[PDB]
Amino acid sequence: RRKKGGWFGKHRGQGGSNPKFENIAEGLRALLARSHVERTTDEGTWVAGVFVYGGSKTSLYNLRRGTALAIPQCRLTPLSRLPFGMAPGPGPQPGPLRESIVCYFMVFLQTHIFAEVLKDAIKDLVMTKPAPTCNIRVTVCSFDDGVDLPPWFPPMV
Amino acid sequence: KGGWFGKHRGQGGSNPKFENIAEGLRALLARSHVERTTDEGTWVAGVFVYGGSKTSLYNLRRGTALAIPQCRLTPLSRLPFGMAPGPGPQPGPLRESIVCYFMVFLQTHIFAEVLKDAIKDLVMTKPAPTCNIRVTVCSFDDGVDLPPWFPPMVEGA
Amino acid sequence: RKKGGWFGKHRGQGGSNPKFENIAEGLRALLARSHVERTTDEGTWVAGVFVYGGSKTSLYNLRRGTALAIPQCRLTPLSRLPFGMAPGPGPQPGPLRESIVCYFMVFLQTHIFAEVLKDAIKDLVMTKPAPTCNIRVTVCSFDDGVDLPPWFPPMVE
Amino acid sequence: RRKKGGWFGKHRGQGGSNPKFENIAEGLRALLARSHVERTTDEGTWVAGVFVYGGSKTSLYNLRRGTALAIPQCRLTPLSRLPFGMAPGPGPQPGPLRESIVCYFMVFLQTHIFAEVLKDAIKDLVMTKPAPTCNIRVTVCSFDDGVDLPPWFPPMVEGA
DNA sequence: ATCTGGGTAGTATATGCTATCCTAATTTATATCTGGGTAGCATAGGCTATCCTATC
DNA sequence: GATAGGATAGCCTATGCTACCCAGATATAAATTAGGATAGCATATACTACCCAGAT
């Protein structure tokens, strides 16, 4: 048939459970269970995370949602396009405002050891799969200053 | 104004306001020479100007585009909620606030930091609707493998 | 439900049967690995193959398969093996003594092709499980002669 | 006359002492005693089978019982029949499995220089006397390999 | 009272979500591919006179 | 004058030959579910000069 609903009542950030994302999250947290890791931090301030890019859009988004479900203590940026970086060799370099076709999403965590573990787990999860999935590159982040947005200084929640 | 002027997504350039903003930036950036370019081509750090407002951020994006040759910009995107004070419990991992951001990648730690510092100081000189701009030293060891194919690489080299 | 009684087929009716058909097909496929004549001009029986061991039914089936595979062979009926000299200088059994192990004997014309048939039967048995592998095969060389010239020309009289 | 039946005690492949079989065995042994040979092997390996055939059924069963008690190490089997073979004429040939009425029984002897002497004795002593028995031609199997020398289970003497 | 820069509506186009087809072990039948056991025709190895010549 | 000697039984011991119909191991096509992915409102920008009032 056609798309079962254009608009589902879910704005940005309204992400529910789904069997595909459920399986992806289960695989990730099984990979994330290979080492003693902490899902959160006491202060819960976002100064680190994971950078994931490359590959097709529909695979990058699914990987983002899977990382979300696997770590309910994470913060995720939306996908967006990319520009073209510096080319190798002394030639005509591209413009700053140009739009590529490569997508990316960013992860906001608290610590960096766990962020490295998450990046490694995502790398393994991608490596287990073919399709555009392997084209999805992953790198690290370290927001030493902060991505501060007032995180409701933790009481009982 | 309004309507499709025929210009596609990502067709902009010089303007006196962004020219002045970039003059201030480079004047701050010219107080100490740094290796603004890298041999490897791929960069090791990015820029994450967030805060202010969408209009101020877009103006600063243009003022950063026309500021240095070693800079390429993503479209502005929004930021995930730290923890929403609206409801009782914590929001979902995907919940995204109204604070915007955009990404431009700079090699080396000092050159990456000074662009953000100049942006902050310039918006501090400006009125307040833009003083709420804060940036972070998002340094990545493994780096980002951006696509280096410049738009004129189809018919030039 | 249907057992096997006297079908009127005397001692010598080598009628085709799918089990014996495929057994013989496999045998002559194995027998096709060497270039040895299946007959001799004078057609005098001075050699053959000796096959024994395993269950009675396996031995009979192997004999029928060798018959169908080589229409230029002569096959003796099955019977029970004797009690050969086992190790141990004790009360050796009677010379007439017979074991519970069955056997059948093949009468061919030459000896090189007889050894080829022996090896082919060995391989054919070896590629099988069940009591089939219990079947043993050894060679024969009737240098004296099992000659018995018939006087009945069954083709026309 | 005095034809009978019923159980007579002894089982399959068991010799007996009868004057006729005694005389046949004495003749064979006397022929076999003209030249000493290794009637058995130091490891008990038989490399020469025996294929007494021909004659008639009764004259062959009696020859079997006569050869039972004349040779130290022999492995005579129950009697069976023989395949037909050739056909009268160049072209036609009978079936492969077609078996004639000439009977035989298998024996085994160690070494190739005692099996031939057994053949000669079991041929002459039983053919150069009875008309209906003058057709037991022997084709003692002169193998170049071995057979199942120990086809025996541990319960020797039908005991332990 | 002009400066002044500095933010700023009003469209084509890329998104966070929710929807809809190739594949990939994963069973799972599906045929095979050989071994049991089925009887008259044949078959052993025992018997007390039978042998009947066949033989002295 | 019995016997050489095959041969003579006939039920005892129990062999097998012809051909199979079942009784399972053993590959092996074919499904099969299930895990990947590919898609629409409603927002989000980029570009559009221009407004347009701080800001004196």
XYZ file of C-alpha atoms (C1' of nucleotides) in Angstrom:
743
model
C 0.000 0.000 0.000
C 0.999 3.618 0.642
C 2.515 5.181 3.755
C 0.253 4.463 6.736
C 0.120 8.051 7.943
C 2.138 11.067 6.871
C 2.182 12.613 10.361
C 2.221 10.373 13.432
C 1.838 12.976 16.170
C 5.496 12.541 17.164
C 7.602 15.709 17.076
C 11.400 15.755 17.253
C 12.581 13.498 20.058
C 9.362 11.459 20.309
C 10.811 7.991 19.827
C 8.958 4.856 20.899
C 9.910 1.198 20.954
C 10.036 -0.836 17.744
C 11.000 -4.476 17.057
C 13.775 -3.467 14.645
C 15.156 -0.871 17.046
C 14.542 -3.338 19.884
C 16.760 -5.945 18.212
C 19.410 -3.350 17.336
C 19.445 -2.102 20.931
C 19.624 -5.649 22.305
C 22.594 -6.407 20.067
C 24.291 -3.172 21.115
C 23.816 -3.675 24.860
C 24.961 -7.274 24.477
C 28.055 -5.782 22.853
C 28.009 -3.098 25.560
C 27.910 -5.864 28.197
C 31.284 -7.262 27.084
C 32.954 -4.718 29.395
C 32.035 -3.153 32.728
C 30.520 0.167 31.641
C 28.409 2.902 33.222
C 25.315 4.154 31.407
C 25.231 7.486 33.270
C 27.119 9.840 35.582
C 26.093 11.431 38.875
C 25.970 15.008 37.581
C 24.725 13.918 34.151
C 26.456 16.724 32.240
C 26.998 16.164 28.515
C 30.660 16.746 27.646
C 31.313 13.734 25.408
C 29.733 11.218 23.065
C 30.107 9.480 19.706
C 30.128 10.821 16.140
C 28.575 8.535 13.516
C 28.436 9.379 9.807
C 28.778 7.860 6.351
C 26.562 5.283 4.688
C 22.983 5.622 3.555
C 20.503 7.870 5.341
C 17.999 5.149 6.254
C 20.760 3.047 7.822
C 22.349 5.935 9.732
C 19.005 6.921 11.231
C 18.294 3.340 12.314
C 21.728 3.074 13.925
C 20.983 6.330 15.766
C 17.676 4.999 17.100
C 19.319 1.725 18.109
C 22.016 3.551 20.057
C 19.212 5.560 21.676
C 17.281 2.507 22.859
C 20.412 0.612 23.923
C 21.446 3.566 26.112
C 18.369 5.312 27.587
C 20.891 7.651 29.261
C 22.162 9.210 26.007
C 21.369 12.355 24.031
C 21.175 12.317 20.240
C 21.322 15.056 17.616
C 19.241 14.782 14.430
C 20.724 13.791 11.095
C 21.839 16.445 8.624
C 23.870 16.784 5.441
C 27.605 17.494 5.269
C 29.884 19.902 3.421
C 32.953 18.843 1.426
C 36.154 18.983 3.449
C 39.644 19.890 2.314
C 40.750 17.989 -0.766
C 44.174 16.309 -0.912
C 46.603 18.286 -3.039
C 46.977 22.007 -3.823
C 43.906 22.470 -5.992
C 40.666 24.468 -5.945
C 39.247 23.861 -2.482
C 35.450 23.713 -2.057
C 33.175 26.351 -0.597
C 31.964 26.450 3.006
C 28.227 26.577 2.201
C 28.187 23.599 -0.185
C 25.994 20.584 0.563
C 27.143 16.972 0.262
C 25.020 13.808 0.381
C 26.696 12.195 3.407
C 24.581 12.245 6.572
C 25.641 12.231 10.215
C 24.211 12.039 13.716
C 25.975 12.912 16.959
C 25.797 11.320 20.412
C 25.991 13.240 23.700
C 27.173 11.266 26.743
C 28.832 12.243 30.032
C 32.138 10.350 30.285
C 34.649 9.370 27.601
C 35.686 5.792 28.439
C 32.072 4.691 28.032
C 31.847 6.784 24.858
C 34.845 4.920 23.437
C 33.208 1.622 24.409
C 29.997 2.693 22.659
C 31.909 3.682 19.521
C 33.687 0.314 19.482
C 30.383 -1.513 19.983
C 28.806 0.423 17.108
C 31.822 -0.378 14.921
C 31.453 -4.093 15.672
C 27.683 -3.954 15.125
C 28.191 -2.344 11.712
C 31.011 -4.758 10.834
C 28.694 -7.722 11.441
C 26.389 -6.438 8.669
C 26.755 -5.827 4.883
C 24.636 -3.442 2.746
C 25.390 0.346 3.008
C 25.800 -0.413 6.758
C 29.565 -0.959 6.369
C 29.852 2.456 4.697
C 28.756 4.028 8.007
C 31.939 5.387 9.590
C 32.138 6.125 13.315
C 34.481 8.415 15.255
C 34.799 9.814 18.761
C 33.803 13.102 20.402
C 35.191 14.997 23.394
C 33.310 18.188 24.306
C 35.803 19.364 26.912
C 33.920 22.645 27.387
C 30.301 21.503 27.239
C 27.115 21.180 25.205
C 25.296 22.653 28.179
C 21.500 22.656 28.171
C 20.090 22.729 31.730
C 19.651 19.024 32.590
C 17.184 19.438 35.477
C 19.737 19.022 38.321
C 18.966 15.489 39.443
C 16.624 15.024 42.396
C 15.046 11.570 42.673
C 14.842 11.223 38.874
C 11.196 39.081 0.476
C 10.346 35.413 -0.148
C 9.775 32.862 -2.860
C 12.184 30.674 -4.795
C 14.666 33.091 -6.346
C 15.963 30.087 -8.283
C 19.016 29.855 -6.033
C 19.413 26.285 -4.807
C 20.129 25.069 -1.277
C 23.633 26.302 -0.516
C 24.150 29.293 -2.835
C 25.468 32.262 -0.863
C 28.500 34.454 -0.283
C 29.908 37.881 0.508
C 27.981 40.597 2.360
C 29.144 43.690 4.299
C 27.703 42.535 7.646
C 29.313 39.101 7.473
C 32.402 40.855 6.112
C 32.653 42.971 9.266
C 31.991 39.976 11.525
C 34.714 37.987 9.775
C 37.062 40.977 9.922
C 36.637 41.002 13.690
C 37.143 37.234 13.815
C 40.334 37.273 11.736
C 41.618 40.312 13.645
C 41.283 38.212 16.783
C 42.665 35.266 14.797
C 45.615 37.315 13.477
C 46.915 38.217 16.949
C 48.831 34.907 16.931
C 49.696 32.914 13.818
C 48.626 29.259 13.783
C 48.794 26.439 11.238
C 45.268 26.999 9.945
C 45.789 24.233 7.351
C 46.908 20.610 7.612
C 48.974 18.346 5.375
C 46.714 15.302 5.753
C 43.654 17.236 4.564
C 41.234 15.645 7.010
C 40.708 17.651 10.188
C 40.955 16.573 13.830
C 38.487 19.015 15.416
C 35.160 20.652 14.691
C 33.135 23.714 15.705
C 29.839 23.561 17.606
C 28.534 27.119 17.910
C 25.283 26.755 19.846
C 22.909 29.128 21.583
C 21.793 32.647 20.702
C 19.011 32.239 18.156
C 18.473 30.737 14.719
C 18.827 34.069 12.913
C 21.928 35.112 14.854
C 23.424 31.656 14.339
C 22.821 31.744 10.574
C 24.375 35.203 10.354
C 27.381 33.905 12.282
C 27.489 30.919 9.917
C 27.836 33.267 6.954
C 30.370 35.340 8.899
C 32.396 32.170 9.452
C 32.041 31.050 5.830
C 33.543 34.331 4.640
C 36.257 34.316 7.303
C 38.834 31.620 6.469
C 39.555 29.283 3.524
C 39.948 26.184 5.734
C 36.324 25.922 6.853
C 33.252 24.068 5.553
C 29.796 24.339 7.101
C 26.865 22.017 7.757
C 23.291 23.289 7.898
C 22.288 24.477 11.346
C 20.695 21.788 13.515
C 19.051 21.624 16.937
C 20.268 20.257 20.261
C 18.896 17.465 22.470
C 17.294 18.346 25.787
C 19.494 18.008 28.824
C 16.513 17.100 30.992
C 13.127 18.710 30.376
C 11.749 20.611 33.405
C 8.227 20.383 31.974
C 7.165 16.856 32.923
C 8.005 14.963 36.090
C 10.457 12.265 34.990
C 13.371 12.668 32.607
C 12.695 13.143 28.878
C 13.585 10.634 26.213
C 17.143 10.366 24.905
C 16.030 11.817 21.560
C 14.256 14.871 23.024
C 15.679 17.931 21.260
C 15.552 21.507 22.547
C 15.180 24.785 20.627
C 18.857 25.730 20.964
C 20.441 25.428 17.520
C 23.962 24.592 16.362
C 26.013 24.085 13.229
C 29.228 22.248 12.442
C 32.393 23.445 10.714
C 35.573 21.391 11.046
C 39.010 22.859 11.823
C 42.323 21.047 12.165
C 44.627 21.585 15.166
C 43.463 22.424 18.693
C 44.430 26.107 18.793
C 42.968 27.059 15.410
C 39.749 25.218 16.248
C 39.467 27.027 19.586
C 40.286 30.536 18.357
C 37.477 30.624 15.776
C 34.917 29.834 18.471
C 36.528 32.311 20.871
C 36.385 35.067 18.249
C 32.739 34.221 17.520
C 31.956 34.489 21.234
C 33.827 37.774 21.655
C 32.228 39.309 18.558
C 28.720 38.377 19.686
C 29.621 39.781 23.110
C 30.486 43.082 21.411
C 27.113 42.938 19.616
C 23.799 43.407 21.558
C 22.318 40.580 23.729
C 20.042 38.503 21.345
C 23.379 36.912 20.361
C 25.478 37.062 23.541
C 24.011 33.672 24.486
C 26.499 31.948 22.163
C 28.761 29.318 23.724
C 31.100 26.920 21.922
C 33.156 23.889 22.923
C 36.544 22.355 22.074
C 35.190 19.233 20.381
C 38.507 17.486 19.757
C 38.481 14.017 18.184
C 41.652 11.928 18.150
C 40.564 9.508 15.419
C 39.358 12.428 13.296
C 36.603 12.675 10.706
C 36.967 11.338 7.154
C 34.909 13.933 5.317
C 34.402 13.617 1.541
C 37.097 15.765 -0.106
C 35.531 15.883 -3.598
C 35.069 19.591 -4.259
C 32.136 20.665 -6.478
C 34.482 21.779 -9.298
C 36.208 18.370 -9.243
C 33.760 17.067 -11.862
C 35.308 19.349 -14.509
C 38.512 20.512 -12.824
C 41.565 19.377 -10.901
C 2.849 -56.647 3.506
C 4.124 -58.564 0.468
C 6.870 -61.032 1.360
C 9.223 -62.817 -1.013
C 8.462 -66.391 -1.966
C 9.374 -68.513 -4.946
C 9.046 -66.242 -7.945
C 10.018 -68.984 -10.388
C 13.423 -67.329 -10.830
C 15.984 -70.123 -10.586
C 19.583 -69.893 -9.380
C 20.923 -67.447 -11.940
C 18.138 -64.995 -12.744
C 19.959 -61.678 -12.541
C 16.893 -59.560 -13.193
C 17.238 -55.806 -12.926
C 15.987 -54.070 -9.782
C 16.358 -50.390 -8.810
C 18.411 -51.187 -5.699
C 20.666 -53.567 -7.616
C 20.474 -51.229 -10.618
C 21.949 -48.273 -8.737
C 24.431 -50.477 -6.855
C 25.701 -51.819 -10.180
C 25.732 -48.317 -11.678
C 27.940 -47.121 -8.835
C 30.158 -50.181 -9.223
C 30.710 -49.728 -12.961
C 31.269 -46.018 -12.373
C 34.018 -47.111 -9.983
C 35.007 -49.797 -12.500
C 35.298 -47.090 -15.174
C 38.248 -45.533 -13.305
C 40.542 -48.134 -14.915
C 40.903 -49.488 -18.453
C 40.773 -53.281 -18.116
C 38.891 -55.711 -20.343
C 35.750 -57.189 -18.792
C 36.154 -60.528 -20.611
C 38.696 -62.854 -22.224
C 38.702 -64.549 -25.625
C 38.688 -68.140 -24.366
C 36.474 -67.225 -21.405
C 38.132 -69.661 -18.993
C 37.499 -69.019 -15.296
C 40.831 -68.974 -13.453
C 40.336 -66.023 -11.101
C 37.810 -63.837 -9.331
C 37.021 -62.064 -6.067
C 36.244 -63.433 -2.598
C 33.799 -61.342 -0.554
C 32.691 -62.101 3.007
C 31.897 -60.537 6.360
C 29.051 -58.305 7.388
C 25.409 -59.272 7.473
C 23.907 -61.849 5.131
C 21.656 -59.367 3.331
C 24.482 -56.896 2.717
C 26.639 -59.663 1.240
C 23.859 -60.892 -1.040
C 23.089 -57.354 -2.219
C 26.765 -56.715 -2.958
C 26.930 -59.978 -4.916
C 23.899 -59.036 -7.016
C 25.349 -55.579 -7.626
C 28.623 -57.073 -8.831
C 26.592 -59.410 -11.056
C 24.604 -56.630 -12.721
C 27.669 -54.387 -13.021
C 29.680 -57.097 -14.798
C 27.526 -59.317 -17.061
C 30.783 -61.202 -17.810
C 31.186 -62.543 -14.252
C 30.295 -65.843 -12.603
C 29.095 -65.766 -9.003
C 28.853 -68.616 -6.508
C 26.027 -68.948 -3.984
C 26.475 -67.684 -0.450
C 27.325 -70.007 2.435
C 28.902 -69.908 5.902
C 32.593 -69.268 6.522
C 34.766 -71.828 8.344
C 36.504 -71.400 11.705
C 40.024 -70.502 10.645
C 42.985 -70.653 12.998
C 42.578 -67.819 15.491
C 45.592 -66.716 17.563
C 46.327 -68.697 20.700
C 47.986 -72.130 20.948
C 45.034 -73.781 22.655
C 42.153 -76.103 21.706
C 41.942 -75.293 18.011
C 38.508 -76.077 16.537
C 37.578 -78.886 14.193
C 38.725 -78.608 10.580
C 35.129 -78.904 9.342
C 33.955 -76.140 11.687
C 31.980 -73.272 10.151
C 31.419 -69.784 11.524
C 28.314 -67.581 11.446
C 29.957 -65.329 8.840
C 28.672 -65.554 5.273
C 30.631 -65.324 2.031
C 30.257 -65.354 -1.729
C 32.823 -65.950 -4.458
C 33.292 -64.403 -7.905
C 34.578 -66.293 -10.957
C 36.235 -64.106 -13.605
C 38.615 -64.824 -16.480
C 41.693 -62.647 -15.817
C 43.481 -61.466 -12.675
C 44.381 -57.801 -13.262
C 40.738 -56.904 -13.863
C 39.832 -59.194 -10.957
C 42.045 -57.118 -8.659
C 40.482 -53.965 -10.118
C 37.022 -55.321 -9.271
C 38.198 -56.257 -5.771
C 39.484 -52.721 -5.181
C 36.294 -51.198 -6.599
C 34.160 -53.331 -4.274
C 36.416 -52.356 -1.364
C 35.909 -48.649 -2.078
C 32.170 -49.092 -2.667
C 31.807 -50.822 0.705
C 34.081 -48.276 2.408
C 31.827 -45.394 1.337
C 28.954 -46.916 3.372
C 28.046 -47.205 7.099
C 25.753 -49.827 8.711
C 27.064 -53.466 8.775
C 28.251 -52.814 5.218
C 31.750 -51.818 6.342
C 31.925 -55.126 8.235
C 32.082 -56.842 4.830
C 35.628 -57.906 3.961
C 36.995 -58.618 0.489
C 39.996 -60.686 -0.612
C 41.363 -61.899 -3.926
C 41.282 -65.245 -5.750
C 43.575 -66.923 -8.280
C 42.301 -70.261 -9.618
C 45.481 -71.186 -11.460
C 44.251 -74.779 -11.805
C 40.765 -74.216 -13.222
C 37.064 -74.242 -12.343
C 36.407 -75.311 -15.929
C 32.984 -76.829 -16.612
C 32.066 -76.674 -20.307
C 28.270 -76.736 -20.618
C 26.404 -78.677 -23.285
C 23.166 -76.642 -23.211
C 23.027 -73.668 -25.630
C 20.241 -71.732 -23.887
C 20.093 -68.953 -26.509
C 18.363 -71.143 -29.109
C 18.166 -74.666 -27.611
C 16.776 -100.063 3.753
C 16.515 -99.109 7.434
C 16.111 -95.533 6.254
C 15.688 -93.173 9.167
C 15.983 -89.606 10.303
C 15.984 -87.724 13.596
C 18.690 -85.972 15.657
C 22.028 -87.859 15.566
C 23.886 -85.608 17.991
C 26.633 -83.800 16.109
C 26.234 -80.364 14.541
C 27.429 -78.598 11.390
C 31.073 -79.029 10.429
C 31.953 -81.809 12.889
C 34.040 -84.789 11.839
C 33.319 -88.430 12.510
C 35.215 -91.715 12.671
C 33.853 -94.067 10.012
C 35.732 -96.989 8.413
C 35.187 -95.630 4.890
C 36.239 -92.110 5.869
C 39.071 -93.684 7.863
C 40.344 -95.481 4.756
C 40.073 -92.348 2.608
C 41.902 -90.317 5.256
C 44.573 -93.013 5.554
C 45.148 -92.954 1.803
C 45.396 -89.165 1.710
C 47.663 -89.017 4.772
C 49.934 -91.751 3.407
C 50.225 -89.749 0.200
C 50.666 -86.644 2.366
C 53.266 -88.453 4.511
C 55.687 -89.017 1.612
C 57.060 -85.470 2.032
C 56.975 -83.461 5.256
C 55.579 -79.931 4.929
C 54.485 -77.096 7.207
C 50.863 -78.144 7.658
C 50.272 -74.840 9.487
C 51.816 -71.385 9.878
C 53.695 -70.063 12.909
C 51.190 -67.177 12.866
C 48.304 -69.197 11.399
C 48.025 -67.452 8.021
C 46.355 -69.382 5.189
C 47.584 -68.401 1.721
C 46.131 -71.280 -0.329
C 42.474 -72.237 -0.543
C 41.091 -75.589 -1.685
C 38.171 -76.042 -4.100
C 37.363 -79.762 -4.300
C 34.660 -80.010 -6.982
C 33.183 -82.426 -9.496
C 32.096 -86.018 -9.097
C 28.649 -86.227 -7.528
C 27.003 -84.870 -4.387
C 27.283 -88.033 -2.281
C 30.773 -88.850 -3.566
C 31.786 -85.306 -2.603
C 30.244 -85.267 0.881
C 31.993 -88.559 1.591
C 35.231 -87.073 0.274
C 34.698 -84.097 2.596
C 34.325 -86.372 5.608
C 37.391 -88.282 4.420
C 39.474 -85.112 4.128
C 38.209 -83.901 7.516
C 40.344 -86.404 9.451
C 43.515 -86.517 7.347
C 45.021 -82.988 7.369
C 46.241 -81.144 10.505
C 45.129 -77.610 9.562
C 42.317 -77.449 6.995
C 39.178 -75.311 6.762
C 36.662 -77.286 4.700
C 33.286 -75.544 4.281
C 29.793 -76.877 3.537
C 29.245 -78.022 -0.028
C 27.752 -75.671 -2.624
C 27.218 -75.530 -6.398
C 29.105 -73.994 -9.319
C 28.287 -71.492 -12.083
C 27.544 -72.757 -15.580
C 30.330 -70.968 -17.449
C 30.735 -70.947 -21.232
C 28.228 -71.933 -23.927
C 28.397 -74.237 -26.963
C 29.485 -71.874 -29.718
C 31.588 -68.735 -30.117
C 28.866 -66.120 -29.734
C 26.224 -67.207 -27.216
C 26.988 -67.083 -23.482
C 24.798 -67.990 -20.476
C 23.774 -65.753 -17.603
C 26.269 -64.506 -15.022
C 24.607 -66.012 -11.949
C 23.624 -69.262 -13.706
C 24.867 -72.143 -11.539
C 25.393 -75.705 -12.772
C 24.897 -78.996 -10.901
C 28.614 -79.592 -10.299
C 29.146 -79.281 -6.550
C 32.109 -78.022 -4.539
C 33.241 -77.189 -1.044
C 35.924 -74.752 0.069
C 38.987 -75.754 2.099
C 42.034 -73.687 3.050
C 45.662 -74.701 3.588
C 48.781 -72.838 4.665
C 51.640 -72.495 2.146
C 51.404 -73.295 -1.573
C 53.550 -76.460 -1.385
C 51.098 -78.452 0.770
C 47.805 -77.468 -0.863
C 48.942 -78.938 -4.191
C 49.883 -82.221 -2.496
C 46.460 -82.291 -0.841
C 44.952 -81.745 -4.293
C 46.914 -84.647 -5.765
C 46.003 -87.028 -2.935
C 42.320 -86.053 -2.714
C 42.109 -86.435 -6.496
C 43.890 -89.756 -7.028
C 42.757 -91.653 -3.930
C 39.082 -90.892 -4.636
C 39.066 -90.989 -8.454
C 41.238 -94.025 -9.268
C 38.773 -96.386 -7.502
C 35.023 -95.537 -7.978
C 33.472 -94.937 -11.435
C 30.896 -92.335 -10.146
C 33.760 -90.696 -8.196
C 36.312 -90.465 -11.024
C 35.258 -86.872 -11.789
C 36.282 -85.023 -8.591
C 38.762 -82.651 -10.196
C 40.434 -80.298 -7.718
C 41.354 -76.676 -8.439
C 43.063 -75.807 -5.142
C 43.037 -72.020 -4.833
C 46.654 -70.891 -5.248
C 46.167 -67.439 -3.757
C 48.742 -64.658 -3.822
C 47.103 -62.971 -0.805
C 45.405 -63.883 2.470
C 41.931 -64.572 3.828
C 40.135 -64.155 7.156
C 42.579 -66.220 9.217
C 40.885 -65.540 12.613
C 37.122 -65.713 11.804
C 36.635 -66.975 15.363
C 34.973 -65.677 18.512
C 36.603 -65.895 21.970
C 34.283 -68.739 23.120
C 36.634 -71.550 22.145
C 35.614 -75.169 22.822
C 32.091 -73.676 22.851
C 32.823 -72.585 26.419
C 34.422 -69.447 27.850
C 18.129 61.908 12.809
C 20.683 59.070 10.912
C 23.712 55.678 12.014
C 24.109 51.134 12.128
C 24.587 46.915 12.101
C 21.848 43.936 12.795
C 18.369 41.026 13.215
C 14.791 39.740 10.031
C 9.401 37.428 6.774
C 8.378 34.043 2.926
C 9.348 30.157 -0.617
C 12.323 25.290 -2.415
C 14.498 21.583 -0.279
C 16.672 18.122 3.917
C 15.395 16.295 8.295
C 12.645 12.829 12.983
C 9.988 10.185 13.086
C 6.689 6.618 11.501
C 5.733 3.128 7.411
C 6.905 -0.862 3.480
C 10.809 -5.237 0.061
C 15.612 -8.317 -0.381
C 18.032 -11.577 1.815
C 19.921 -15.525 5.564
C 20.431 -18.777 8.199
C 16.775 -22.070 9.640
C 14.291 -25.558 9.638
C 11.915 -29.154 7.007
C 10.060 -31.777 4.294
C 11.962 -34.843 0.195
C 13.686 -38.232 -2.029
C 17.107 -41.344 -1.906
C 20.341 -45.160 -0.446
C 21.399 -48.605 1.520
C 20.238 -52.686 5.285
C 16.552 -56.249 7.473
C 13.372 -60.222 6.881
C 10.217 -62.818 3.256
C 9.919 -69.564 0.492
C 10.679 -73.500 -2.836
C 14.559 -74.342 -4.982
C 18.660 -75.887 -3.213
C 21.246 -76.869 0.640
C 24.657 -79.350 4.894
C 26.547 -83.905 8.002
C 23.882 -87.775 11.001
C 22.136 -92.656 10.965
C 22.467 -98.499 10.849
C 21.230 -100.893 8.161
C 20.958 -100.303 3.894
C 23.433 -101.223 0.742
C 23.809 -103.093 -5.191
C 27.134 -103.661 -7.539
C 31.348 -104.259 -7.557
C 35.030 -107.229 -5.397
C 37.309 -109.755 -3.581
C 29.911 -113.134 3.147
C 30.793 -109.662 4.261
C 32.493 -105.731 2.548
C 34.668 -101.287 -0.762
C 32.250 -98.189 -1.323
C 29.647 -94.326 -2.549
C 25.048 -94.060 -1.768
C 20.703 -93.759 1.535
C 17.915 -92.130 3.905
C 14.814 -88.139 6.183
C 14.251 -85.272 10.039
C 17.945 -83.530 12.779
C 21.120 -79.687 12.457
C 20.128 -76.214 10.278
C 22.758 -73.378 4.808
C 21.819 -70.774 1.279
C 19.018 -68.113 -4.632
C 15.455 -65.545 -6.559
C 13.656 -61.300 -5.835
C 11.731 -57.972 -3.381
C 8.466 -54.516 0.828
C 9.567 -52.076 4.701
C 13.069 -49.389 8.175
C 15.528 -46.638 9.070
C 20.508 -42.699 7.936
C 21.773 -39.041 4.666
C 22.048 -35.384 1.868
C 19.039 -31.724 0.043
C 15.966 -28.784 -2.394
C 12.297 -25.329 -0.497
C 10.098 -22.954 2.446
C 10.248 -19.424 6.405
C 10.846 -15.820 9.789
C 13.149 -12.421 10.669
C 16.614 -9.001 10.276
C 18.006 -5.729 7.565
C 16.898 -2.215 5.288
C 13.808 1.243 1.799
C 9.303 5.288 2.375
C 4.931 10.345 4.316
C 3.465 15.610 8.031
C 5.679 18.893 10.220
C 9.511 21.199 11.267
C 14.568 23.043 9.979
C 17.472 25.513 7.205
C 19.469 28.559 2.943
C 18.590 32.340 0.238
C 16.009 36.176 -0.714
C 16.970 41.356 -0.224
C 14.413 44.168 2.847
C 13.177 46.056 7.107
C 13.711 48.268 10.886
C 13.991 49.659 15.168
C 18.182 49.772 18.868
C 20.407 53.171 19.614
C 22.153 56.504 19.855
